[PDB]
Design a binder for these strands. Structure first.
Ligand SMILES: [Cl-]
Ligand SMILES: [Cl-]
Ligand SMILES: [Cl-]
Ligand SMILES: [Cl-]
Ligand SMILES: [Mn+2]
Ligand code: NA
Ligand code: NA
Ligand code: NA
Length: 326
DNA sequence: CGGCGTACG
DNA sequence: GCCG
């Protein structure tokens, strides 16, 4: 088992779901306390289990697996022996974990803001609503729409949203294309939002595109919230039978020269991308982001025409999006 | 022990 | 928390 998640296929569904979910609780809890290192180790250990070809049934099966030391192995041992891990259950029922989870799930609220509200004594969404003086416009929108934004986005929602985005994109710039990215491109059947990547086959024609797209969506009455650029974090009005619901949508524009990097970067998973960038820098001495891949010795950028090109330049076997579910 | 991804709004 |  390779040490980096980008070196191994990780399918969406797997054979160690319960074990990985427990480790991901501890990762999330570490993040709420600002312990980025422990979050990463627990996320990586969870991801290793997702990549295994069969269920872990005995502690000896963890020997030799990367990212399993004393702590992660003890979590698994307790789950195998008793069905429950006391540390995980203690986190789950803790006031700190439940409130930080509630607050950070709000669009416009991160760990730092959640933590400050927690320390101020705030615990519920209504606590936040009964004091709007302390909220940004973004947080007001996230709180107003919180119920709808907590409802899973379904694949039927995605097709409808893609059609309306293409319509606006086609008026803003004929020839521009819209590509579905994020978790739905990895095969997820649900999500918390929908992610689209927009480009144009003629390098440079995409400049200035996103304001033009946004103005046209807003004129069609489809935008419940937008910041107003190359990235837009929107709340869309999605028609439903006899009504509608708010849905988070991310729109990102890239020039066609950068499209493979942006596609790779926005297709995820989040852990896969961090591991890929870590691998690139630490193992290959190359600097990767969603714009390109830089050789800092030669001071040159790798021209890629495909995601396949990028994996080859990094010396990695190609993984389709469905195997990037780290 | 140092490192832990790397951007944009 | 774990790796190198
Ligand atoms: Cl840490
Ligand atoms: Cl409507
Ligand atoms: Cl591609
Ligand atoms: Cl980036
Ligand atoms: Mn998104
Ligand atoms: Na948030
Ligand atoms: Na997404
Ligand atoms: Na980091």
């Amino acid at each position: 088992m390779p040490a980096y998640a980008c070196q191994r296929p990780t399918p969406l569904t797997h054979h160690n779901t319960g074990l990985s979910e427990a480790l991901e609780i501890l990762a999330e809890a570490a993040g709420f306390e600002g312990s980025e290192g422990r979050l990463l180790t627990f996320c990586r250990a969870a991801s290793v289990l997702k990549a295994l070809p069969s269920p872990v049934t005995t502690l000896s099966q963890l020997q030799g697996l990367p990212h399993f030391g004393e702590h992660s192995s003890r979590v698994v041992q307790e789950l195998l022996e008793h069905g429950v891990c006391e540390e995980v259950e203690r986190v789950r029922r803790s006031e700190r974990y439940q409130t930080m989870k509630l607050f950070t799930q709000i669009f416009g609220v991160g760990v730092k803001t959640a933590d400050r509200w927690y320390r101020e004594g705030l615990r519920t969404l209504d606590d936040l609503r009964e004091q709007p003086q302390k909220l940004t416009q973004q947080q007001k929108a996230g709180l107003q729409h919180h119920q709808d934004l907590s409802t899973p986005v379904l694949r039927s929602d995605v097709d409808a949203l893609q059609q309306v985005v293409e319509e606006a994109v086609g008026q803003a710039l004929p020839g521009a294309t819209v590509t579905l990215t994020g978790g739905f491109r990895r095969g997820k059947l649900q999500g918390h939002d929908v992610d689209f990547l927009i480009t144009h086959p003629k390098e440079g024609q995409e400049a200035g595109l996103l304001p033009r797209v946004m103005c046209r969506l807003q004129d069609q009455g489809l935008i419940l919230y937008h910041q107003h650029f190359e990235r837009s974090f929107c709340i869309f009005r999605l028609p439903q039978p006899g009504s509608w619901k708010a849905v988070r949508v991310d729109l990102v524009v890239a020039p066609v020269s950068q499209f493979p990097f942006a596609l790779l970067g926005w297709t995820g998973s989040k852990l896969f991308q961090r591991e890929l960038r870590r691998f690139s820098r630490k193992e290959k001495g190359l600097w990767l982001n969603s714009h390109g891949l830089f050789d800092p010795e030669q001071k040159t950028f790798f021209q890629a025409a495909s995601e396949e090109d990028i994996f080859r330049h990094l010396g990695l076997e190609y993984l389709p999006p469905e195997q990037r579910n780290a």
